Amino acid sequence: KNKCVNFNFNGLTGTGVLTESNKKFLPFQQFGRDIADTTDAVRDPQTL
Amino acid sequence: KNIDGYFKIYSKHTPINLVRDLPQGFSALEPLVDLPIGINITRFQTLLA
């Protein structure tokens, strides 16, 4: 966390700062997005 | 609804004080399940206790 790194979250490729989310979410949500349709967050498949 | 076999079911439960046919206000139905079945449906029915 808090580091620029590559990642593959069950196919959710990308690169950026992973840190804890202080934002709400649905029970069935798998990730979030911004106005730019860019992956803004993600749920880990092993620790939701 | 059944989209490409994925039979989707949204739902919600809330208290009300309805004194009419249907209520006012606003509330959206969250998803519940998702079933890739893949059949042809043209009519349905309801059950009662």
UniProtKB/Swiss-Prot annotation, chain A:
It comes from the Viruses. Changing residue 13 to K: In strain: Omicron/BA.1. Attaches the virion to the cell membrane by interacting with host receptor, initiating the infection. The major receptor is host ACE2. When S2/S2' has been cleaved, binding to the receptor triggers direct fusion at the cell membrane. When S2/S2' has not been cleaved, binding to the receptor results in internalization of the virus by endocytosis using host TFRC and GRM2 and leading to fusion of the virion membrane with the host endosomal membrane. Alternatively, may use NRP1/NRP2 and integrin as entry receptors. Binds to host ACE2. RBD also interacts with the N-linked glycan on 'Asn-90' of ACE2. Cleavage of S generates a polybasic C-terminal sequence on S1 that binds to host Neuropilin-1 (NRP1) and Neuropilin-2 (NRP2) receptors. Interacts with host integrin alpha-5/beta-1 (ITGA5:ITGB1) and with ACE2 in complex with integrin alpha-5/beta-1 (ITGA5:ITGB1). May interact via cytoplasmic c-terminus with M protein. May interact (via N-terminus) with host bilirubin and biliverdin, thereby preventing antibody binding to the SARS-CoV-2 spike NTD via an allosteric mechanism. This is Spike protein S1. It comes from Severe acute respiratory syndrome coronavirus 2 (2019-nCoV). The gene is S. The chain holds residues 535 to 582 of 1273 of the full protein.
Curated annotation (Swiss-Prot), chain B:
Attaches the virion to the cell membrane by interacting with host receptor, initiating the infection. The major receptor is host ACE2. When S2/S2' has been cleaved, binding to the receptor triggers direct fusion at the cell membrane. When S2/S2' has not been cleaved, binding to the receptor results in internalization of the virus by endocytosis using host TFRC and GRM2 and leading to fusion of the virion membrane with the host endosomal membrane. Alternatively, may use NRP1/NRP2 and integrin as entry receptors. Glycans are attached at residue 40. This is Spike protein S1. Changing residue 21 to G: In strain: Beta/B.1.351. Binds to host ACE2. RBD also interacts with the N-linked glycan on 'Asn-90' of ACE2. Cleavage of S generates a polybasic C-terminal sequence on S1 that binds to host Neuropilin-1 (NRP1) and Neuropilin-2 (NRP2) receptors. Interacts with host integrin alpha-5/beta-1 (ITGA5:ITGB1) and with ACE2 in complex with integrin alpha-5/beta-1 (ITGA5:ITGB1). May interact via cytoplasmic c-terminus with M protein. May interact (via N-terminus) with host bilirubin and biliverdin, thereby preventing antibody binding to the SARS-CoV-2 spike NTD via an allosteric mechanism. It comes from Severe acute respiratory syndrome coronavirus 2. It comes from the Viruses.
